[PDB]
């Protein structure tokens with residue numbers, strides 16, 4: 001009866017409340033996706049339980065086991081009823097799970113420590129001094145690996161065989177690496193996260209150039225799930241009423257520190 | 259077995275070629291959606307016939323008869339198998355037809371004749387010498403009618419009662435009205451069209467301010483159509499491969515004349 005929602009601890013989408021240890025259930029969490037989940041559930045008429053994905057991953061199929069990990073895996077193997085998180089709609093995922101229309105629009109972007117002499121993906125691909133990588137088990141990494149576009153293919157060829165590994169387990173790891181490499185490391189991540197970090201202390205990173213592509217986040221459900229239709233219509237309704245724009249302003253800029 | 263595609267004459271999505279009169283069938287047309295249709299048909303493996311929507315409209319429901327017009331209507335009443343055009347994904351439409359994930363992201367925008375003292379929707383709403391309206395039977399008009407946001411709610415109350423009518427039958431009429439009103443008419447239309455016209459002679463218009471919202475265009479099919487699934491996956495692949503971005507650059511800026 002109670003809908004099991006899988007999500008991920010990724011600021012500002014889902015974060016632990018400062019006093020979480022003294023709270024119970026859903027009240028332990030706060031953020032863009034926590035607010036969105038409450039709204040979706042209310043408009044669809046269901047009770048739910050927020051659960052943090054076990055492996056803390058978004059979702060990718062292991063090439064040798066062919067088993068899906070992350071929130072995608074939670075949906076595919078029946079551990080969760082729905083995923084409400086900054087989960088990117090992609091072809092490989094849409095083949096195994098359903099997605100509502102996008103509740104957020106974004107694109108792969110470049111994050112640099114302020115002062116880094118880099119203004120585009122082309123700038124990165126033509127140099128070697130500054131290292132650059134992406135998030136593991138994410139859609140950005142999958143994008144580069146499967147891209148036939150000149151500049152991106154070249155970037156992927158470098159990243160896949162760069163040593164030490166230029167990939168990170170979480171965005172927080174990528175951000176920290178950018179901040180500590182004194183401009184010698186650039187991080188490729190979605191514009192949404194890039195823009196968020198750019199508004200947080202110590203205000204030493206920035207998004208440079210335009211986005212490399214265009215995509216969106218969607219609320220996901222198991223393939224053929226009955227919840228799918230209601231959830232999709234709810235997302236459209238909430239977007240048309242400006243709720244999503246309000247949540248973005250609330251968590252990104254109203255609370256900005258820079 | 260030939261798929262009947264309903265579309266609309268809206269540059270640069272679908273336009274008649276210069277020598278269209280000596281051409282036949284699909285060959286008569288060119289544009290972003292013409293190229294998209296060919297790609298979709300190729301990847302989904304079907305032959306098709308492009309047909310221009312009879313009433314030249316996108317799609318809205320008549321409040322009294324409850325009858326859908328435009329391309330939406332042709333899908334709903336079984337006149338076309340698919341709609342490949344700059345058709346906006348909205349709640350009221352999704353309730354009667356199916357939409358693929360978006361192939362283009364955009365938002366409502368403000369078109370002004372260069373020099374017009376307007377920088378935002380708030381500005382328009384706070385004044386009256388400059389009239390403004392939108393396209394009839396389109397998603398922008400519906401947006402304003404259904405929006406509960408203060409500023410947009412106010413703008414709607416004004417447009418719905420304005421006399422003469424501030425509404426137009428086609429974007430071409432709206433653009434023409436802007437160009438001939440010596441700055442006394444502002445046109446509310448989607449950013450895609452606004453940005454296109456801004457790169458067209460006589461280069462006397464421009465998009466001002468940011469978008470009023472975020473939405474997307476989707477390929478539409480009759481609710482429950484067997485084609486929906488393949489088409490949706492086709493759109494996702496084309497976007498990930500960079501084709502959609504390629505077509506945008508091809509029809510918007512590579513051919514810009516300003």
Ligand SMILES: Cc1onc(C(=O)O)c1C[C@H](N)C(=O)O
Pocket residue numbers: 010058059086087088089134135137138139140141171188189190193
């Ligand atoms: C968040 C987030 O921020 N940046 C990324 C990325 O993959 O670069 C992600 C994960 C991505 N949305 C996905 O794999 O769904």
Ligand SMILES: Cc1onc(C(=O)O)c1C[C@H](N)C(=O)O
Pocket residue numbers: 268316317344345346347392393395396397398399429446447448451
């Ligand atoms: C194109 C196009 O460009 N501007 C508009 C509009 O409704 O303002 C439209 C129509 C809209 N995409 C729809 O009603 O689907």
Ligand SMILES: [Zn+2]
Pocket residue numbers: 016020
């Ligand atoms: Zn804690």
Ligand SMILES: [Zn+2]
Pocket residue numbers: 297300301
């Ligand atoms: Zn192709």
